[PDB]
Write a protein that binds this ligand. Structure first.
Ligand SMILES: C=CCN(C)CCCCCCOc1ccc(C(=O)c2ccc(Br)cc2)c(F)c1
Ligand SMILES: C=CCN(C)CCCCCCOc1ccc(C(=O)c2ccc(Br)cc2)c(F)c1
Ligand SMILES: CCCCCCCCOCCOCCOCCOCCO
Ligand SMILES: CCCCCCCCOCCOCCOCCOCCO
Lengths: 619, 619
């Protein structure tokens, strides 16, 4: 039955594999990457008329009928995203008259205007002179002086937040202004009567910070700020020490962009670091077939290659398949062997993790390290010395990274401080990196491959953590993937692998939940709204990936030979394309709950395969 | 008569001009650059059989009958240069047996062996494990803590010294060892009965540092060195901050190589600085036509382009010559507009100097700045705006560099501390950058063209400086060019340009000295020995450059219509090659009096033209 689905899915995946032997699907986010790029180019005085044209095509193409832009496809209009897209276009050429510019302008107005957008948006606008700097939460160079164990030192923030904060402290330190030509000034972003509805600090504002901010803004005004020259040079130095191999910082868009702005502020355009940073940008860009161009928020090669392998194996290919080997060898050269920023909490831990992207040695993550190691543990390579070797370093590093509660975070250990969540500046997404159910589940499944189990103290501490986190309805939240369908699938699949008894009550209470959310069309789906309003948990249009996820939670808990189970397999079988692929016009990836969503291009192909591979196993 | 000669020299130079519009002659030094590269490659584990071949044919081709290598051509065998070339070869393939390995080994031994070589040589050997680290002068990371105004802080050393010291402090901090395979171990460098005759610190040993070093080597042995981790990172960051545009450090070989070694030590072979630093190396290499390969100690494009222009103008071509304009435009894009290290003594000085090489913004020198500005002054470029403007910026940067005595140094102001000259480590060449007669003369000659006479207090302070420095026999020492013939030509040619009276006594006492040293063959020549033993001042085989120098001192002081004057012009007119060029198998350039000599390829072509250009003027 489904067997021709598996055969077609396989050959397809294999067609996607690059030569070097890895898979790499583009990462989808939202138009702010491109809009901010347009502005970075203006700031760095490096505008390419031809590029802008491809950009403008994309920006419009992405705009909706109502004239707004959202975070995920089919999502509510977003103010920040639309403001930034609006200014981006008006600068590229569009006149505030044109139908498209018209619609958006009226939406931005209906919302209270520029005064209702996040810090980043008002800050970007501050940079081109269309918004007062005095009204932007202040982050000072001096933060560089807080020691390792101090409230708010840069190591209390999550990896991604950290590097951005440092880059910005230099920029906010000088509060520079790169004027836009009159042609693109956007005063009209203020023309509204609607009351400005401002978003506050992610975790609630303490009148303390509010005051501290006001304090910092006045201080900024003095004629002399002692040791500030130093604070800066401490930041710049922190920056130059980490710049990734591809010229980026952390392999993510934000700190990368800010770090480049920062060197321009510091008159260092002709310094190796600035040059590598500038030209490394091109690797993240993507030429869209319909004429546009988009910039990736980050890149997922290692991650794609990792899942790719596991799916093709669970799906059937021999552990020594000449094509799967190209991948194994490739993954081995990827392992990171030097102290990262994680070393600050675990100095006697031996380097051995992996990154999400190509070259990013200072920021390996537990999620990637686990999937890559586990994946290797399923292949038979030529240099069995290295495979054995690599797997252990990664493994010992994963265990070394386990946080206090028994679960794993993404980049750091016990990055659970609650302090950063209240600063005025922090009003967008997560800012700390605490342990999550999904990353933890992926670790356990990994250990479980090697056979470790409920008997080992490390694994019990974890399962205790998962048991305590389980939601009332027996579902598990999905931190890096949308959402409860993602998390529950991950946990139940893991708990099954670490020997736990699939019959337990809390486990059953979970599968019931999964069978209970199947759409009429057989498959499962969960809309990104499930982070905002609970009435959406497990509800949403069916997707090949989210179906595949619910399928694993069932196949894992024994219910493989079920109705909902066989009904779901039908969905994947029916909806597959003639080439073996799958379509998925929705986002199933999560950047930050409620604020940033991602589209993982390979999920639609890999997971359906991995689920079908495991179904063909239960038989 | 001479006109056909000049006419040909002019067209020859014009044929050497690269496309972009600049001239660039290879810089010749000695085989240590290549021998050290071979070792750098071993250390960094990046050996290319094919290069080692070219490097071997080259080292061999440079060895002499007696089986030794010298600093300059026709110079006395050099122990350091030979030891290093010996080890280089033995590593590439040569067996201690073969004729070359034999003759050199004998020389080496007859000198006391490895124990008689400079610090660098014993240090390089220490790095591959053929010499104890404990016996090498120690320079610690901690030197990084001495403040701006403290005995021995890194800013008391000259630009070139400084960067090397920083790079090394990190290396000496770890005292790493990269073992050579048994095949190349060189124990035989110790097998000698001759008493090891060690060279001491440049200015002299103080029993203090002699103690303090033992001090350090002792502290080096402890189990704990507080704040050293941070002393190191200071040196690391210091380096990351100043890395040149081409990935080098200071555009010179020493700090560049040591900085790379230092990064490797710190597992930073995955970092942007090191990558760019490593691939930058190819630009300095040179493919030799006989199948050899040599690495330049530094590169002189700006410098060549500068004189090139001045010679072609003094010779005749229109100040608006479409060919010189390509050069003018090029030189304008070269001007450095950011605070260098010189800013540490002159914070309110506006950047406007130029560098010796292509991209080296942190280290512009007065010599280049002066020649480039002046040469531009003799042109008419299509952008009288930028031309007028740069000259002014550079002018001021020159003016603001004028040291305490009125005379300029190369890279820094009053870099006259006498302290560094006594450290055990400093036993090779200069280590500070005090003002010299030649740089000062080139500055004066620059102002001169604008129209600035002896009225201006600026000028006078300088001329006072020169007058006081003049040697007993009316000659002027040559710091960056060999030697008294160089200096004296520079001075007298300058004093003439700043309005001074060519008839004065001290001036005449100079020209007489010129006339008095003319070699019978009509020209002038000065051997590099004139730095070691006074007998050679103004003595040595006649060269096209040195002749042209003595010719300017004469044309300047009125004696253009003289015997020695027309006799010298005869020499150039004749010795000139059929293509228009000139040959010059000797070095006329000075790296460090007595220790490091350079061969400026373009000197043989540019100066004879410039001297003939000025003779065709006095008529
Ligand atoms: C799925 C499994 C693999 N997993 C371990 C890696 C995937 C997560 C990393 C990719 C996301 O990268 C980011 C991250 C953030 C941002 C911010 O906007 C941000 C927001 C706030 C701040 Br403060 C700074 C930047 C961004 F733009 C991109
Ligand atoms: C005439 C034109 C203008 N003039 C100012 C520029 C020409 C001089 C710069 C070119 C030479 O550069 C150097 C310099 C040094 C060294 C050292 O060996 C050295 C030895 C000891 C130490 Br401690 C450090 C480096 C070197 F190898 C090369
Ligand atoms: C430079 C001192 C050598 C000691 C290195 C151990 C550093 C441990 O890492 C601490 C955490 O900071 C993250 C470092 O990654 C940055 C690279 O810095 C370069 C060499 O340390
Ligand atoms: C990085 C803080 C910005 C203040 C720097 C201006 C300091 C003036 O220079 C002092 C002398 O140090 C030499 C600097 O050249 C090195 C580059 O460092 C990067 C930016 O200054």
């Amino acid at each position: 039955a489904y067997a021709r689905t598996l055969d077609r899915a396989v050959e397809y995946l294999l067609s996607c594999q690059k030569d070097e032997g890895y898979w790499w699907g583009p990462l989808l986010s939202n138009v702010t990457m491109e809009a901010e790029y347009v502005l970075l180019c203006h700031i760095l005085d490096r505008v390419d008329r031809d590029r802008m044209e491809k950009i403008r095509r994309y920006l419009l193409h992405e705009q909706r009928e109502d004239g707004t832009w959202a975070l995920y496809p089919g999502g509510p209009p977003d103010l920040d995203t639309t403001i930034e897209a609006y200014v981006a276009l008006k600068y590229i050429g569009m006149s505030r008259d044109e139908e498209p510019m018209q619609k958006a302008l009226r939406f931005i107005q209906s919302q209270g205007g520029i005064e209702s957008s996040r810090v980043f948006t008002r800050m970007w606008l501050a940079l081109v002179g269309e918004y007062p700097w005095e009204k932007v939460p202040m982050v000072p160079p001096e933060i560089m002086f807080l020691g390792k164990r101090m409230p708010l030192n840069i190591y209390e923030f999550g990896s991604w937040a950290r590097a951005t904060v440092v880059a910005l402290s230099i920029v906010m330190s000088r509060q520079p202004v790169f004027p836009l030509p009159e042609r693109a000034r956007v005063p009209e972003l203020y023309e509204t009567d609607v009351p400005p509805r401002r978003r506050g600090a992610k975790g609630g504002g303490g009148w303390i910070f509010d005051a501290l901010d006001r304090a910092l803004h006045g201080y900024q005004k003095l004629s002399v700020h002692p040791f500030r020259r130093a604070a800066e040079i401490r930041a710049l130095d922190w920056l130059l020490e980490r710049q990734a191999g591809d010229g980026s910082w952390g392999g993510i868009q934000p700190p990368w962009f800010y770090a480049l702005i920062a060197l321009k502020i510091l008159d260092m355009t002709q310094h190796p670091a600035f040059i590598k940073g500038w030209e490394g940008l091109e690797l993240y860009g993507v030429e869209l077939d319909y004429g546009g161009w988009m910039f990736q928020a980050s890149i997922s090669p290692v991650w794609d290659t990792g899942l790719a392998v596991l799916a093709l194996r669970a799906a059937g290919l021999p552990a020594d398949h000449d094509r799967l080997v190209k991948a194994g060898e490739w993954l081995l050269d990827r392992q990171i062997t030097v102290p990262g920023d994680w070393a600050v909490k675990r100095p006697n831990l031996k380097p051995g993790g992996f990154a999400f992207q190509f070259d990013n040695v200072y920021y390996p993550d537990v999620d990637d390290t686990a999937v890559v190691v586990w994946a290797l543990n399923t292949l038979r390579l030529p240099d069995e010395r290295r495979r054995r070797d690599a797997m252990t370093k990664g493994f010992r590093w994963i265990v070394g990274m386990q946080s206090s509660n028994g679960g794993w975070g993404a980049y750091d250990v016990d990055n659970t401080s609650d302090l950063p969540n209240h600063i005025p500046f922090c009003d967008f997404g997560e800012v700390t990196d605490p342990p999550s159910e999904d990353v933890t589940a992926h670790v356990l499944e990994c250990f479980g491959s090697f056979g470790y189990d409920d008997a080992w103290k490390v694994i019990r501490r974890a399962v205790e953590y998962l048991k305590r986190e389980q939601k009332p309805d027996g579902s598990w939240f999905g931190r890096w993937g949308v959402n409860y369908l993602y998390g529950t699938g991950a946990v139940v699949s893991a708990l099954k692998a670490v020997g736990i008894d699939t019959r337990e009550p809390y486990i059953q209470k979970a599968l019931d939940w999964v069978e209970q959310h199947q759409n009429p069309d057989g498959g499962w789906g969960e809309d990104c709204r499930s982070y905002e309003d609970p009435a959406y948990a497990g509800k949403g249009a069916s997707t090949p990936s989210q179906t595949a996820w619910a399928l694993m939670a069932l196949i894992a808990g024994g219910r493989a030979e079920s109705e909902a189970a066989r009904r779901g397999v039908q969905y994947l079988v029916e909806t597959q394309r003639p080439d073996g692929g799958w379509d998925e016009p929705y986002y199933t990836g999560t950047g930050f709950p409620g604020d940033f969503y991602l589209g993982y291009t390979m999920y639609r192909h890999v997971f359906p395969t991995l689920a079908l591979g495991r179904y063909k196993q239960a038989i």
